[PDB]
Design an enzyme around this catalytic site. Structure first.
Site, PDB file in Angstrom:
ATOM      1  N   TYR A 198       0.830  -1.193   0.000  1.00 34.08           N
ATOM      2  CA  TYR A 198       0.000   0.000   0.000  1.00 34.08           C
ATOM      3  C   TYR A 198       0.869   1.248   0.000  1.00 34.08           C
ATOM      4  O   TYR A 198       2.072   1.203   0.265  1.00 34.08           O
ATOM      5  CB  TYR A 198      -0.953   0.019   1.202  1.00 34.08           C
ATOM      6  CG  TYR A 198      -0.271   0.249   2.530  1.00 34.08           C
ATOM      7  CD1 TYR A 198       0.307  -0.800   3.225  1.00 34.08           C
ATOM      8  CD2 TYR A 198      -0.212   1.515   3.090  1.00 34.08           C
ATOM      9  CE1 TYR A 198       0.926  -0.593   4.436  1.00 34.08           C
ATOM     10  CE2 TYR A 198       0.406   1.730   4.298  1.00 34.08           C
ATOM     11  CZ  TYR A 198       0.972   0.673   4.968  1.00 34.08           C
ATOM     12  OH  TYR A 198       1.591   0.885   6.176  1.00 34.08           O
ATOM     13  N   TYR A 200      -9.303   7.282  11.237  1.00 31.71           N
ATOM     14  CA  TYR A 200      -8.879   7.819  12.521  1.00 31.71           C
ATOM     15  C   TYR A 200      -9.789   8.927  13.037  1.00 31.71           C
ATOM     16  O   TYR A 200      -9.839   9.149  14.251  1.00 31.71           O
ATOM     17  CB  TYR A 200      -7.440   8.329  12.412  1.00 31.71           C
ATOM     18  CG  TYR A 200      -6.463   7.223  12.100  1.00 31.71           C
ATOM     19  CD1 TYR A 200      -6.386   6.098  12.904  1.00 31.71           C
ATOM     20  CD2 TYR A 200      -5.640   7.289  10.988  1.00 31.71           C
ATOM     21  CE1 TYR A 200      -5.506   5.080  12.622  1.00 31.71           C
ATOM     22  CE2 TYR A 200      -4.756   6.273  10.697  1.00 31.71           C
ATOM     23  CZ  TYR A 200      -4.694   5.171  11.517  1.00 31.71           C
ATOM     24  OH  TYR A 200      -3.814   4.154  11.235  1.00 31.71           O
ATOM     25  N   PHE A 207       2.030   9.828   3.415  1.00 28.45           N
ATOM     26  CA  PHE A 207       2.334   9.628   4.826  1.00 28.45           C
ATOM     27  C   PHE A 207       2.729   8.204   5.181  1.00 28.45           C
ATOM     28  O   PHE A 207       3.279   7.998   6.269  1.00 28.45           O
ATOM     29  CB  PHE A 207       1.145  10.054   5.704  1.00 28.45           C
ATOM     30  CG  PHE A 207      -0.051   9.149   5.608  1.00 28.45           C
ATOM     31  CD1 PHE A 207      -0.177   8.049   6.437  1.00 28.45           C
ATOM     32  CD2 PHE A 207      -1.056   9.408   4.698  1.00 28.45           C
ATOM     33  CE1 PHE A 207      -1.275   7.224   6.351  1.00 28.45           C
ATOM     34  CE2 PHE A 207      -2.156   8.584   4.610  1.00 28.45           C
ATOM     35  CZ  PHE A 207      -2.263   7.491   5.437  1.00 28.45           C
ATOM     36  N   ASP A 208       2.478   7.224   4.319  1.00 24.59           N
ATOM     37  CA  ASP A 208       2.864   5.849   4.595  1.00 24.59           C
ATOM     38  C   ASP A 208       2.944   5.077   3.291  1.00 24.59           C
ATOM     39  O   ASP A 208       2.224   5.371   2.334  1.00 24.59           O
ATOM     40  CB  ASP A 208       1.883   5.158   5.544  1.00 24.59           C
ATOM     41  CG  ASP A 208       2.475   3.927   6.193  1.00 24.59           C
ATOM     42  OD1 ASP A 208       3.660   3.630   5.935  1.00 24.59           O
ATOM     43  OD2 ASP A 208       1.757   3.252   6.959  1.00 24.59           O
ATOM     44  N   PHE A 267      -5.595   5.577  -0.457  1.00 28.09           N
ATOM     45  CA  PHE A 267      -4.633   4.486  -0.452  1.00 28.09           C
ATOM     46  C   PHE A 267      -4.546   3.863  -1.834  1.00 28.09           C
ATOM     47  O   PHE A 267      -5.542   3.797  -2.557  1.00 28.09           O
ATOM     48  CB  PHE A 267      -5.014   3.408   0.562  1.00 28.09           C
ATOM     49  CG  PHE A 267      -4.852   3.834   1.985  1.00 28.09           C
ATOM     50  CD1 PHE A 267      -5.916   4.365   2.685  1.00 28.09           C
ATOM     51  CD2 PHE A 267      -3.636   3.705   2.622  1.00 28.09           C
ATOM     52  CE1 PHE A 267      -5.768   4.757   3.993  1.00 28.09           C
ATOM     53  CE2 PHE A 267      -3.484   4.098   3.928  1.00 28.09           C
ATOM     54  CZ  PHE A 267      -4.551   4.624   4.615  1.00 28.09           C
ATOM     55  N   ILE A 273      -7.962   0.014  10.206  1.00 35.44           N
ATOM     56  CA  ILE A 273      -9.128   0.885  10.164  1.00 35.44           C
ATOM     57  C   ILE A 273     -10.247   0.221   9.365  1.00 35.44           C
ATOM     58  O   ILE A 273     -10.032  -0.738   8.613  1.00 35.44           O
ATOM     59  CB  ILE A 273      -8.771   2.258   9.573  1.00 35.44           C
ATOM     60  CG1 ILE A 273      -8.002   2.089   8.264  1.00 35.44           C
ATOM     61  CG2 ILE A 273      -7.960   3.068  10.564  1.00 35.44           C
ATOM     62  CD1 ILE A 273      -7.599   3.392   7.622  1.00 35.44           C
TER      63      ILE A 273
END
Lengths: 387, 375, 820, 107
Positions: free
Chosen positions: D26, D82, D36-37, D99, D56
């Site tokens: 991902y 979140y 961010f990731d 994502f 999540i």
């Protein structure tokens, strides 16, 4: 009022006195037993006196008429009363030593002896170790006083404190003269501000408190650091830090030089920015490297933080904040989210300045101890934005 | 419990191993001798093959020992509230001190050879700043007793043994040019922190040793935890030995400087400080004599406490003698106007009565001899 | 833009370097949550790229290396380095196999030294713990300060160490080539970051034996061969690189010391087995000695009647050759110890050529050469080289100073010891962080886990060697110093630390003595413990002396003076947080006075006998500061003790003078109960200060004077009057509900028990008329009340139980004494 | 609050089921476009088992609609994510997450 106090007062400037004989020529000659002289407080400029109302006090120079302010040192309390000694034209015979001669202070006109007031009981629980100094007909057996030399550095610092306090009090009252009285299309209607004297005094003090150069050798660098810390402590203990803060506040009630001119005139407002910058620089010099002075801002930190957005002395105020945060963990323990957000807004509104990053770094760790609250607040209010 | 106690072969293996480690380090590693101080100092005193240029570099950058001394001086001169403990400085001070002494009809030739060898070993240190380092560390300790100041005093004694006039001159010159009051303030504080005989502590120790306690893991036979009567006797002896060595050889300038410091802003009379400590010691000795006067025979604990107090008194007497010999007229007058006479009166009383008491039993002949040489 | 453009954009370069500095600062000192957050900004791929990037400016290269260390390695490295100073060696076969020298044929006294850091080490070190950085994981339902503490983000350690080794080798070759464009712009910027990374991984223990051999080859290819390639030590590096090399060599010296300790432990394991077998055999044949010996058999069996420490001391007392008669060991057994001693001395380089041939000679020569080649300007570097040199010159001394922290444990205790080491590591990590709620939870749980560990109770010597009581004292003095006058935060952690220290004292007398070494250090922090309730530093100090004659006698007079000064302060100025809660302002603090009085009680009374040395000092101090006696017993204008007790009873009966008048607060303080509790505690202390009957009949003047002073202070009529005061008895009525007095706000039998103790120890009962007069007014009504309360309903009541204790501890023993 | 857009089609028959581990790669971005990731900068596929609520909600519902080998873009609403709190220092409050997920294999 005069007291017998011990402890840190033995190294402060308010315990310094100047012995002034009742003559100008050869006033520097050797002191002699029974020689009449005035005693002057160096920092306040007031002379020891015996008044009919309050007894033993310190009075201004306009009330020292050689009858209330005449004292002499006597080797013993015996009523000699032999004859009035005649002064010689020279250094004279050396009589009284430093730290070895035991001297009794006697008021010349009244014959009373300098002694303590025998403090009333139930006052010891208050922690009052001070004993009021009084003039008494008999006194006690332990009324003898040791005369101890004072360093040239301390004497000069005390006189500078006196002069600076007088000048800045005059400046403060001049500012308050037109605190809410716009001049309109006319003169400020008051005495002129000592602009040039204040500027020169600020520059002299800034050069007086300059840290020693890093290229000096270790021993003299440490000696200069010790002297600088001592002078900073003396000035802080005499209230010069609070005096500078008062001047800064009274100048800071005006948003800009034109706003200041609307009340004090253009000729006075053309030095407003310079004076405020010099005041911030002097404050930074006074508190730099001194943990005791930096810890004073642990109660008034919004005073420094709320001024970060001021455009006239942004660098100076940031430097003051940096000096405060570098030395005092007490200030770090009181840092709040609004303070951190103000420091971040400083970046947002003034641009990418690495000194703000250094301030934020100092907010995290001091003396090898980390502050989780500060670290988390910085991480939460600065990183996720990615702007 | 002696007849029912457990043999060693029944103990658990780990317990026996821990006991063996304790016994082995106590009886085999501690007892081992390894003299490396002289070899270390000799190795550090050599400049390595930098003499193939012989240019105006004659500034002559310090050799490793000189650099170590300068580093310790630097860490001593730093402005700090207190002088922190430093095992590295401790160990190197012990090494330097042990490098200097290295010591029945000795002839004059080898007597002088020993003197010159000691002089050279002291020169290796005082030509590299050790004399200044000692004074700086004493000033930095600010009158706080501890192992750091003990090591500094031992190093000072080691480089001053025999009355090294060159080291005395260097120390006096350094003190006079610096004009700092911290050195004598620290000396006065250390002398005021020196202890004397304490009858309350003596009685508490008597009760503690009479109870006879043991421990859990095994059984300790009257554990020998630190003596609480004149605990710092060695520190007092080395402090007063250092002060004596400052004046050894009738150094008139240092004898006068101990009495008064002309250039400084304030003056401390080390002679009068020594007299005050002598008075306190004499009063303690008189109290001990009064405690033991009723008893017919002094026991071993009392004898040992008397002996250590007498040794401290011997050192103080030698220090005063070194202050005044030469003669130093200022020191003589200062002593004549002090409470030295009261101390001597008390000592004479104690001497007379203790001689008469100790002469009545031969088990105390050694203590009597010590008392006589103190007189 | 390309980040390599920052080699000419200097303002952006400085700003980004300070940004990296801020990244390191926010996650500094164990902020693993912030490190996990930072993993989202500078990812692992970026960090690994920056490590190998050869065109990065020096500041950015150093900043990225330090950022990788801070995010991923700093916490684990610090926790491991904290644990590297202790040697807990399990007695396992791997430990048994350890020898000082590798098996070889160089020489019997000493073979050739092995490679430092290479071999088998068995000393216990807790493993590293890491958590994968993932930002799609579900948000924990646990709230803040209750969720488990975050671990450091994970990064592949094997790949990282391989990359670090390759980078170090390439840097060494590049430095040998003497290029004019070193990586990072300078030799310092090329070498310092890589050496920092390698040192961190070495301390963490990532490198294996082959990796350590390679590192040794780079350091010195000639000295470190087992059986331009110029090594690091011959490349003429600047002072920062020299400092990093000093760190590496310090690590290897630590490894050598650890190897010596472990070899000593292994030899201890073998030699203990041999000694035990021999001693068992010797005892076996000694049991038949009566057939060929005499009463001197006690000398031979004196070994078996002596403590095992002394037995092993005598068994090892054969070194000087003048002690070969008392030692009963055979020469074959003696030879093994002598051979091991010789080979240990050889391994320490005592006694038994330009090539150093060993780590010790290499380090010593390197330090001396560095010092004599130039005037070293870095104080940190100078201290490093001279510490390193001193370690080489005194290896036996280093080992001797290291042994006190060495301990051997059974292999069955390894897992519990590992858990205890983990908990101690969490405790130690919080010495460098400002105190907070999450840290308080971690302190409490770590202390609880330690206390629930069987090792903590089975090895008090180990727990003492680990410095755990010092660490707990340090954290608790930190929290006390924080807000030391206005308000104390984290009372739960404060009482956790205090209860832990009290149990630590209770474990063993050696632990109690170690805690007693900080008696004044606890007392000076005990001034502000008054607002806190439960276990306090004063309680710890009291537990550090209780029932220990040696510590009671060794108690210094200054500590007692401090306690009495605190008591006098309590007797003159009311309690401030009591005032802040609306309580009426009386002129003293009975609550604080009582808790100082009980400490004095524990100080002056040991094992049922009065410690006269402490008692005389306490009495003298108390009379020198008379305000410690309360508003009553003040002398001039002061009421008597009985009048004070009656006034306190009236205060208790009258609200708006006993409480705030707004338990209701779950610890409600009642002024009357506090007052008679204070006076009972004072009378108990004075009675325990009374001289013993043997000192009395011996006619000792000091004992007689002390007894006379106590009698002057407390009058017998007042004692009897207090004993004769009625007690509220649980009655029945109003549908039959029990009307029981509140024992926390009423006159209780303990107040009478204190008076009885004073009467017995000070005045005593000597005449029959006085005995009967005491019986018929003070004791007999209480006995009758207790007898009445022994019914089906009232028997288990609090007042009945208190009366039973009062009778069976104060009244009945006194009557038994007065039986004749 | 899950919106799934296909980028590269999968096999089309295999689908994750409750109690089955999904191995994915991902790359998380905020809806502003800020990364961010990403599991690919770590060179390690991310494993999680469907139904245990380790991730999540948007991932659990989103990946369940994906097939093996499919590359899809998931737009997660903040309340499926979140939410108001947000991952501190990483994801701001009230953030919509985007994502790029690839279902490598089911194990």
């Amino acid at each position: 009022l005069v007291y017998y106090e011990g402890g840190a007062v033995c190294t402060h400037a308010r315990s310094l006195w100047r012995l002034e004989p009742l003559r100008i020529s050869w006033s520097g000659s050797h002191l002699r037993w029974g020689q009449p002289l005035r005693i002057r407080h160096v920092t306040t400029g007031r002379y020891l006196a015996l008044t009919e109302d309050q007894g033993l006090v310190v009075v201004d120079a306009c009330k020292a008429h050689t009858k209330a302010t005449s004292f002499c040192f006597r080797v013993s309390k015996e009523k000699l009363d032999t004859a009035p000694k005649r002064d010689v034209e020279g250094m004279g015979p050396p009589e009284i030593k430093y730290g070895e001669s035991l001297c009794f202070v006697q008021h010349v006109a009244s014959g009373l002896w300098l002694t303590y007031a025998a403090p009333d009981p139930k006052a010891l629980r208050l922690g009052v170790l001070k004993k009021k100094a009084i003039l008494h007909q008999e006194g006690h057996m332990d009324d003898a006083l040791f005369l101890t030399r004072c360093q040239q550095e301390e004497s000069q610092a005390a006189r500078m404190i006196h002069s600076t306090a007088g000048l800045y009090n005059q400046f403060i009252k001049g500012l308050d003269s037109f605190s809410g009285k716009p001049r309109g299309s006319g003169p400020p209607a008051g005495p002129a501000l000592p602009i040039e004297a204040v500027i020169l005094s600020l520059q002299d003090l800034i050069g007086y408190f300059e840290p020693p150069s890093e290229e000096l050798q270790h021993e003299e660098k440490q000696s200069k650091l010790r002297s600088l810390r001592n002078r900073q402590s003396l000035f802080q203990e005499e209230g010069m830090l609070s005096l500078v803060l008062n001047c800064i506040d009274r100048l800071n009630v005006y948003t800009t030089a034109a706003h200041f001119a609307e009340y004090a005139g253009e000729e006075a407002a053309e030095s407003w920015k310079e004076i405020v910058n010099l005041l911030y620089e002097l404050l930074a010099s006074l508190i730099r490297g001194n943990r005791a002075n930096c810890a004073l801002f642990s109660t008034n930190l919004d005073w420094v933080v709320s001024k970060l957005d001021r455009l006239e002395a942004s660098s100076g105020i940031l430097e003051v904040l940096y000096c405060v945060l570098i030395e005092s963990p007490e200030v770090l323990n009181i840092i709040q989210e609004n303070h951190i957000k103000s420091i971040i807004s400083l970046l947002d509104k003034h641009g990418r300045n690495h000194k703000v990053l250094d301030v934020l770094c100092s907010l995290c760790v001091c003396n090898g101890v980390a502050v989780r609250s500060n670290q988390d607040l910085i991480t939460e209010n600065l990183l996720p934005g990615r702007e | 419990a002696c007849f029912r106690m457990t043999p060693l072969y029944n103990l658990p293996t780990h317990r026996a191993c821990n006991m063996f480690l304790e016994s082995y380090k106590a009886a085999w590693i501690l007892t081992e001798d390894h003299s490396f101080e002289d070899r270390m100092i000799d190795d550090l005193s050599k400049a390595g093959e930098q003499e193939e240029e012989e240019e105006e570099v004659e500034e002559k950058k310090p050799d490793p020992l000189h650099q170590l001394v300068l580093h310790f001086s630097r860490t001593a001169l730093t402005e700090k509230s207190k002088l922190d403990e430093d095992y590295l400085y401790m160990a190197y001070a012990d090494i330097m001190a042990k490098s200097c002494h290295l010591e029945v009809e000795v002839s004059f030739e080898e007597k002088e050879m020993e003197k010159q060898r000691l002089l050279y070993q002291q020169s290796r240190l005082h030509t590299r700043g050790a004399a200044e380092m000692v004074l700086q560390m004493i000033s930095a300790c600010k009158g706080e007793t501890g192992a750091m100041v003990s090591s500094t005093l031992k190093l000072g004694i080691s480089i001053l043994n025999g009355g090294n006039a060159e080291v005395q001159q260097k120390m006096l010159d350094y003190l006079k040019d610096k004009k700092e009051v911290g050195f004598f303030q620290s000396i006065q504080a250390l002398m005021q922190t020196c202890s004397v005989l304490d009858l309350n502590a003596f009685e508490r120790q008597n009760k503690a040793e009479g109870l006879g306690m043991v421990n859990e893991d095994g059984t300790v036979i009257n554990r020998q935890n630190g003596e609480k009567v004149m605990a710092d006797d060695e520190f007092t002896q080395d402090l007063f030995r250092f002060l004596q060595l400052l004046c050894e050889g009738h150094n008139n300038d240092f004898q006068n400087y101990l009495r008064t410091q002309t250039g400084n802003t304030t003056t401390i009379n080390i002679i009068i400080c020594t007299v005050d400590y002598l008075l306190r010691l004499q009063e303690s000795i008189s109290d001990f004599y009064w405690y033991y006067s009723g008893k017919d025979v002094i026991e071993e604990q009392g004898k040992r406490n008397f002996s250590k107090a007498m040794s401290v008194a011997k050192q103080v007497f030698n220090s005063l003698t070194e202050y005044i010999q030469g003669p130093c007229t200022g020191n003589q007058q200062s002593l004549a106007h002090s409470r030295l006479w009261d101390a001597v009166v008390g000592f004479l009383h104690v001497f007379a009565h203790m001689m008469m008491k100790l002469a009545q039993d031969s088990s105390q002949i050694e203590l009597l001899k010590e008392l006589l040489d103190l007189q | 833009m390309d980040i390599l453009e920052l080699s000419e954009r200097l303002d952006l370069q400085r700003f980004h370097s300070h940004t990296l500095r801020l990244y390191r600062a926010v996650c500094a000192l164990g902020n693993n949550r912030v490190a996990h957050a930072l993993c989202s900004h500078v990812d692992q791929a970026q960090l690994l790229h920056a490590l190998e990037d050869a065109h990065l400016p020096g500041p950015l290269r150093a900043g990225y290396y330090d950022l990788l260390i801070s995010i991923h390695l700093e916490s684990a490295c610090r926790s491991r380095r904290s644990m590297l100073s202790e040697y807990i060696v399990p007695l396992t076969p791997e430990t048994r196999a350890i020898t000082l020298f590798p098996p070889g044929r160089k020489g019997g006294n000493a073979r050739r030294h092995g490679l430092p850091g290479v071999g088998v080490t068995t000393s216990l070190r807790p493993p590293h713990h890491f958590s994968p950085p993932c930002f799609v994981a579900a948000l924990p339902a646990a709230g803040v300060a209750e969720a488990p503490a975050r671990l450091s983000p994970a990064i592949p350690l094997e790949a990282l160490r391989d990359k670090a080794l390759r980078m170090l080798g390439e840097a060494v070759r590049d430095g040998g080539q003497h290029a004019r464009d070193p990586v990072g712009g300078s030799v310092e910027f090329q070498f310092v970051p890589v050496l920092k990374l390698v040192s961190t991984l070495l301390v963490m223990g990532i490198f294996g034996d082959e990796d350590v051999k390679q590192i040794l080859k780079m350091i010195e290819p000639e000295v470190f061969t087992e059986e331009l390639e110029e090594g690091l030590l011959q490349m003429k590096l600047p002072e920062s690189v020299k400092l990093q090399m000093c760190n590496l060599l310090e690590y290897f010296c630590d490894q050598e010391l650890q190897h010596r300790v472990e070899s000593l432990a292994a030899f201890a394991e073998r030699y203990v087995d041999k000694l035990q077998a021999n001693q068992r055999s010797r005892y076996a044949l000694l049991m038949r000695a009566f057939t060929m010996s005499a009463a001197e058999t006690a000398r031979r069996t004196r070994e078996f009647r002596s403590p095992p420490q002394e037995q092993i001391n005598m068994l090892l007392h054969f070194k000087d050759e003048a002690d070969e008669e008392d030692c009963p060991l055979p020469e074959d057994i003696r030879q093994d110890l002598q051979d091991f001693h010789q080979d240990l001395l050889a391994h320490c380089g005592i006694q038994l050529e330009k090539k150093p041939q060993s780590l010790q000679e290499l380090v010593s020569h390197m330090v001396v050469r560095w010092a004599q080649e130039d005037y070293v300007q870095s104080p940190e570097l100078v201290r490093a080289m001279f510490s390193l040199l001193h370690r080489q010159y005194d290896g036996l001394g280093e080992l001797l100073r290291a042994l006190p922290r060495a301990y051997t444990i059974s292999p069955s205790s390894v897992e519990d010891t590992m858990s205890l080491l983990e908990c101690l590591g969490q405790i130690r990590s919080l010495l460098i962080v400002q105190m907070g709620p999450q840290e308080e939870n971690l302190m409490i749980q770590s202390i609880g886990n330690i206390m629930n560990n069987k090792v903590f109770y089975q090895h008090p010597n180990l727990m003492r060697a680990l410095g755990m009581h010092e660490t707990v004292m340090e954290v608790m003095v930190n929290v006390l110093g924080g807000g030391e006058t206005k308000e104390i935060r984290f009372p739960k952690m404060v009482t956790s630390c205090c209860r832990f220290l009290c149990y630590f004292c209770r474990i063993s007398r050696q632990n109690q003595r170690s805690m007693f070494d900080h008696l004044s250090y606890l007392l000076e922090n005990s001034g502000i413990g008054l607002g806190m309730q439960g276990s306090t530093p004063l309680d710890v100090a009291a537990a550090s002396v209780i029932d220990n004659n040696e510590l009671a006698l060794a108690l210094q007079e200054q500590d007692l003076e401090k306690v009495v000064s605190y008591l006098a302060g309590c007797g003159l100025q009311s309690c401030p947080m009591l005032l802040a809660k609306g309580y009426p302002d009386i002129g003293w603090n009975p609550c604080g006075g009582e808790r100082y009085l009980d400490f004095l009680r524990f100080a002056v009374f040991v094992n049922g006998e009065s410690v006269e040395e402490n008692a005389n000092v306490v009495v003298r101090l108390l009379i020198r500061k008379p305000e410690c006696f309360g508003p009553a017993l003040r002398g001039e204008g002061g009421s008597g003790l009985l009048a004070a007790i009656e006034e306190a009873i009236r205060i208790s009966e009258d609200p708006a003078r006993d409480g705030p008048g707004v338990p209701p607060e779950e610890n409600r303080v009642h002024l009357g109960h506090a007052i008679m509790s204070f006076y009972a505690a004072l009378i108990d202390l004075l009675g325990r200060c009374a001289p013993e009957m043997h000192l009395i009949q011996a006619g000792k003047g000091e004992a007689l004077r002390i007894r006379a002073i106590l009698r002057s202070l407390v009058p017998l009529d007042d004692l009897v009057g207090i004993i004769s005061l009625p007690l509220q008895i649980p009655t029945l009525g109003k549908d039959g509900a029990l009307v029981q007095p509140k024992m926390s706000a009423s006159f209780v039998p303990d107040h009478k028990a204190s008076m009885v103790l004073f009467l017995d120890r000070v005045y005593g009962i000597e005449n029959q008329d006085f005995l009967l007069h005491v019986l018929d007014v003070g004791f007999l009504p209480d006995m009758r009340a207790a007898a009445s309360l022994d019914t089906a309903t009232f028997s288990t009541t609090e007042m009945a139980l208190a009366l039973n204790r009062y009778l069976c501890l104060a009244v009945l023993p006194l009557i038994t004494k007065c039986a004749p | 609050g899950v919106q799934v857009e296909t980028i590269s089609p999968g096999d089309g028959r295999t689908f994750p089921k409750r109690g089955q581990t999904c191995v994915v790669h991902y790359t998380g971005m905020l809806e502003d476009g800020k990364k961010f990731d990403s599991s690919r900068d770590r060179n390690k596929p991310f494993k999680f088992m469907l139904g245990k609520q380790e991730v999540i909600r948007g991932w659990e519902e989103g990946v369940a609609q994906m097939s093996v080998g499919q590359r899809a873009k998931l737009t997660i609403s903040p309340d499926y994510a979140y939410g108001a709190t947000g991952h501190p220092g990483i994801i701001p409050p009230h953030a919509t997450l985007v994502f790029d997920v690839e279902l490598l294999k089911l194990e």
